[PDB]
Write an enzyme that holds these catalytic residues in place. Structure first.
Site, short mmCIF file in Angstrom:
data_model
loop_
_atom_site.label_atom_id
_atom_site.label_comp_id
_atom_site.label_asym_id
_atom_site.label_seq_id
_atom_site.Cartn_x
_atom_site.Cartn_y
_atom_site.Cartn_z
CB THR A 41 17.66 26.11 36.36
OG1 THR A 41 18.61 25.51 37.23
CG2 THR A 41 18.35 27.15 35.53
CD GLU A 42 14.65 20.61 35.32
OE1 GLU A 42 14.60 20.92 34.12
OE2 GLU A 42 14.02 19.68 35.82
CE1 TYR A 43 20.21 20.01 43.36
CE2 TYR A 43 18.45 18.52 44.01
CZ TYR A 43 19.76 18.93 44.07
OH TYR A 43 20.62 18.19 44.82
N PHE A 55 31.34 31.77 36.76
CA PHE A 55 30.32 32.82 36.90
C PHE A 55 30.08 33.11 38.39
NE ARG A 67 33.20 23.55 29.05
CZ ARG A 67 33.68 23.10 27.89
NH1 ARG A 67 34.25 21.93 27.88
NH2 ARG A 67 33.57 23.76 26.75
CG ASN A 68 28.71 24.00 29.50
OD1 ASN A 68 28.92 24.50 30.60
ND2 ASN A 68 29.39 24.35 28.41
CG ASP A 108 25.57 27.06 31.74
OD1 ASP A 108 24.61 27.53 32.39
OD2 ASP A 108 26.67 26.70 32.24
CB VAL A 149 25.60 26.57 41.56
CG1 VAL A 149 24.20 26.07 41.25
CG2 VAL A 149 26.20 27.14 40.28
CB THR A 176 32.69 27.97 44.10
CG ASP A 178 31.01 26.41 25.92
OD1 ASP A 178 31.78 25.55 25.39
OD2 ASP A 178 31.21 26.90 27.02
C1 LIG Z 1 29.01 20.53 37.78
N1 LIG Z 1 29.96 19.82 38.25
N2 LIG Z 1 28.49 21.46 38.60
C2 LIG Z 1 28.91 21.63 40.01
C3 LIG Z 1 27.73 21.09 40.81
C4 LIG Z 1 26.55 22.04 40.55
C5 LIG Z 1 26.23 22.04 39.05
C6 LIG Z 1 25.09 22.91 38.67
C7 LIG Z 1 25.23 24.18 38.05
N3 LIG Z 1 24.16 24.92 37.68
C8 LIG Z 1 22.91 24.44 37.90
O1 LIG Z 1 21.81 25.13 37.55
C9 LIG Z 1 21.84 26.17 36.68
C10 LIG Z 1 22.38 25.99 35.40
C11 LIG Z 1 22.39 27.05 34.51
C12 LIG Z 1 21.90 28.30 34.87
O2 LIG Z 1 21.93 29.33 33.98
C13 LIG Z 1 21.48 29.18 32.68
C14 LIG Z 1 20.52 28.21 32.34
C15 LIG Z 1 20.03 28.06 31.04
C16 LIG Z 1 20.52 28.91 30.06
C17 LIG Z 1 21.52 29.87 30.38
C18 LIG Z 1 22.01 30.01 31.69
C19 LIG Z 1 21.38 28.49 36.16
C20 LIG Z 1 21.36 27.43 37.05
C21 LIG Z 1 22.70 23.12 38.54
C22 LIG Z 1 21.33 22.56 38.75
N4 LIG Z 1 20.30 22.98 37.91
O3 LIG Z 1 21.15 21.69 39.58
C23 LIG Z 1 23.81 22.40 38.92
C24 LIG Z 1 27.45 22.41 38.21
#
Ligand SMILES: *C(=N)N1CCC[C@@H](c2cnc(Oc3ccc(Oc4ccccc4)cc3)c(C(N)=O)c2)C1
Length: 266
Positions: free
Chosen positions: A83-85, A22, A134-135, A148, A25, A21, A130
């Protein structure tokens, strides 16, 4: 019917576990078979129409080291980005887990993975804006992917937008002084990210406030060498921090430098 190529029908998602927990997720499935992450955007946090338009562009970006966008759920609020996991979560937390007992060849490969993603983006004139540990995300095979990318553009909360939650520690002097974003601001941030990797996830400038960091950097001072980095690795990260933006390398040059070190420290 009723969906663009960029649009996922939310009825095709099976939710399975909250990841963090934008907004929230979640981990789940798409059409029963495909593992996915589903980022649920909080009402009011994002410029959604602008984001949607950008998503169309983003769906055409495709590289092994970039987290793959599957699409967006736009017809209701909260909107979802799918997105992919990435099973091993954020790079920053992964680095901080001391159990991994990383060898420096593994740290170098993480840098290379990110560098490959960033060379691709640079080849498409797409700025991340960015880049930071972290990203970045880590899959079940330990492969690091850039995530991101460009997202900061559509965040409405002003504290993130300008130079108190802005990425001061990942920003070159011209950004902090003048708001001058460019490919070379991504290069700067990449070097800081290499520092994060080789520090096993220390916060850059760990004893300074953002305020002090901005002043340190403006005076010409830099991050110093993490103990796990060899002199050649430190040379690479440092080259990203030239005071003159146009004296910083490109991502193609950085990739060639990383490959050379990998070969020499094989
Ligand atoms: C890091 N500690 N954490 C907490 C655990 C979950 C992690 C996380 C966050 N997001 C995603 O997937 C994701 C990422 C980005 C998104 O938006 C996006 C993508 C590309 C360009 C712009 C915006 C959407 C979903 C995951 C994951 N893919 O497993 C994991 C964050």
């Amino acid at each position: 019917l009723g969906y663009g190529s960029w649009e996922i029908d939310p009825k095709d998602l099976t939710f399975l576990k909250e990841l963090g927990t934008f907004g929230v997720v979640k981990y789940g499935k798409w059409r029963g078979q495909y593992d996915v992450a589903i980022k649920m955007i909080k009402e009011g946090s994002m410029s959604e129409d602008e984001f949607i338009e950008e998503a169309k562009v983003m769906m055409n970006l495709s590289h092994e080291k970039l987290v793959q966008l599957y699409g967006v759920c736009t017809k209701q609020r909260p909107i979802f980005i799918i997105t992919e996991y990435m099973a091993n979560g954020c790079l920053l937390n992964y680095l901080r887990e001391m159990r991994h007992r990383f060898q420096t060849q593994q740290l170098l490969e993480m840098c290379k993975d990110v560098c490959e993603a960033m060379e691709y983006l640079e080849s498409k004139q797409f700025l991340h804006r960015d880049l930071a540990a972290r990203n970045c995300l880590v899959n079940d095979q330990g492969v690091v992917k850039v995530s991101d990318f460009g997202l900061s553009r559509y965040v409405l909360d002003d504290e993130y937008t300008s130079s108190s939650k802005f990425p001061v520690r990942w920003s070159p002097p011209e950004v902090l002084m003048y708001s001058k974003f460019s490919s070379k601001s991504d290069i700067w941030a990449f070097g800081v990210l290499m520092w994060e990797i080789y520090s096993l996830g220390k916060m850059p400038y760990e004893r300074f406030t953002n305020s002090e960091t901005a002043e340190h950097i403006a005076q010409g001072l830099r991050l110093y060498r993490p103990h796990l980095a060899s002199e050649k690795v430190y040379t690479i990260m440092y080259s990203c921090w030239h005071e003159k933006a146009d004296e910083r390398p490109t991502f193609k040059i950085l990739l060639s430098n990383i490959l050379d070190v990998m070969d020499e420290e094989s």
